[PDB]
Design a binder for this molecule. Structure first.
Ligand SMILES: Cc1cc2nc3c(=O)[nH]c(=O)nc-3n(C[C@H](O)[C@H](O)[C@H](O)COP(=O)(O)O)c2cc1C
Length: 350
């Protein structure tokens, strides 16, 4: 915790920049990457499962926004995530929202927030990279392109990164781009989603926001099954400021808070979505996952996969592994043989 004590004082973005640099250098030396693997490598083989036609050695993965440009792909294997998702990328390179774009909320252990180098820089990294783990791609609309031209942006990006990806995630959820959450409306989403599905064979997913009405989510789920999409990703950062326990929230201004406050919504969303389109499509639960018992409530609610961002900043290097072994324990304690078996156990027994 002393490193965190040293690290929390410097601005969160600048601290991330340094942490980012350090992990990029660890991927440079192959043996130390192997050695960090050789320090916490045994992943219980039961945890491995195959979802939407791609298999995953473990269910826990890194949520988009950490490596947006795909510079430290190799580093993440040693950290012990099952799968990786490169941060949200827009076809044409976009400067992110100007500073200060990131704030800390210590007491709730939450943070508030599409800077990217484009599909070009990513494809170059994907043209000379040996994937230790399955890597995913999160696609987004460039801020400059209007709503009419947006469908072409989402399409144009999909072809560039599509073949070199394990799965595609469509980001219509993150609040930090104006008039993007509105695209989540079904009639606008169908042109976007249908176009991407045709352009690449790799499975495609859509990322929903947690601040949407219950009726809306049931309509978006009906779109996905028709479009035969792989999965639904729930949830992105929420705009609501309710429940926070770190002072001076009001001033900080626009953004999406992420972490433990979001958890209660992400579970509810996961509960609803799994009952409706559980069998037809996969579900990945993201947002506010920090402990093994928290992750266990997600897996038993039908989350085939789990990604999280906030946990890593506060948890540390062990955090990835302790979740896995914690889940692995529950699987042995439940008499389960693999991961798919335990998925949706809390729901089926109902
Ligand atoms: C500070 C921050 C910024 C993020 N930015 C993005 C983003 O721009 N695009 C995206 O697709 N996901 C982004 N994410 C990931 C999502 O927030 C994540 O899927 C989820 O909503 C929150 O995960 P967590 O609560 O486990 O940290 C970001 C996460 C954090 C913490």
């Amino acid at each position: 915790p002393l490193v965190r004590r040293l690290l929390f004082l410097i601005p969160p973005e600048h601290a991330h920049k340094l942490v980012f640099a350090v992990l990029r250098g660890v991927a440079a030396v192959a043996p130390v990457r192997r050695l960090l693997r050789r320090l916490l490598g045994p992943t219980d083989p039961v945890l491995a499962s195959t979802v939407f036609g791609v298999r995953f050695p473990a269910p826990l993965g890194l949520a988009a926004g950490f490596d947006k440009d795909g510079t430290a792909l190799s580093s993440w294997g040693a950290m012990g995530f099952g799968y990786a998702e490169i941060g949200t990328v827009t076809a044409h390179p976009q400067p992110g929202n100007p500073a200060p774009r990131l704030f800390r909320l210590a007491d709730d252990r939450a943070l508030l927030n599409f800077n990217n180098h484009g599909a070009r820089a990513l494809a170059i990294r994907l043209a000379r990279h040996r994937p230790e783990i399955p890597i995913g791609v999160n696609i987004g609309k460039t801020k400059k392109t209007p709503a009419g031209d947006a469908v072409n942006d989402y399409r144009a990006s999909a072809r560039m990164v599509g073949p070199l990806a394990s799965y595609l995630v469509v980001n219509v959820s993150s609040p930090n781009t104006p008039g993007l959450r509105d695209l989540q409306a079904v009639e606008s989403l169908r042109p976007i989603l249908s176009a991407v599905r045709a352009e690449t064979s790799t499975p495609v997913l859509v990322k929903i926001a947690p601040d949407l009405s219950d009726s809306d989510l049931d309509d978006i789920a009906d779109l996905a099954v028709e479009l035969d999409l792989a999965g639904i990703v729930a949830t992105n950062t929420t705009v609501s400021r309710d429940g926070l326990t770190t002072p001076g929230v009001d001033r900080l201004g626009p953004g999406g808070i992420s972490g433990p406050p979001l958890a209660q919504r992400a579970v509810q969303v996961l509960r609803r979505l799994y009952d409706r389109v559980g069998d037809r499509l996969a579900l990945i639960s993201v947002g506010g996952i920090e402990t093994a018992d928290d992750a266990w409530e997600r897996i038993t609610a039908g989350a085939s996969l789990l990604q999280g961002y906030t946990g890593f900043i506060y948890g540390g290097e062990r955090w990835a592994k302790d979740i896995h072994e914690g889940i692995a324990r529950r699987l042995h304690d439940g008499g389960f043989g693999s991961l798919h078996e335990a998925v949706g156990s809390a729901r089926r027994r109902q």
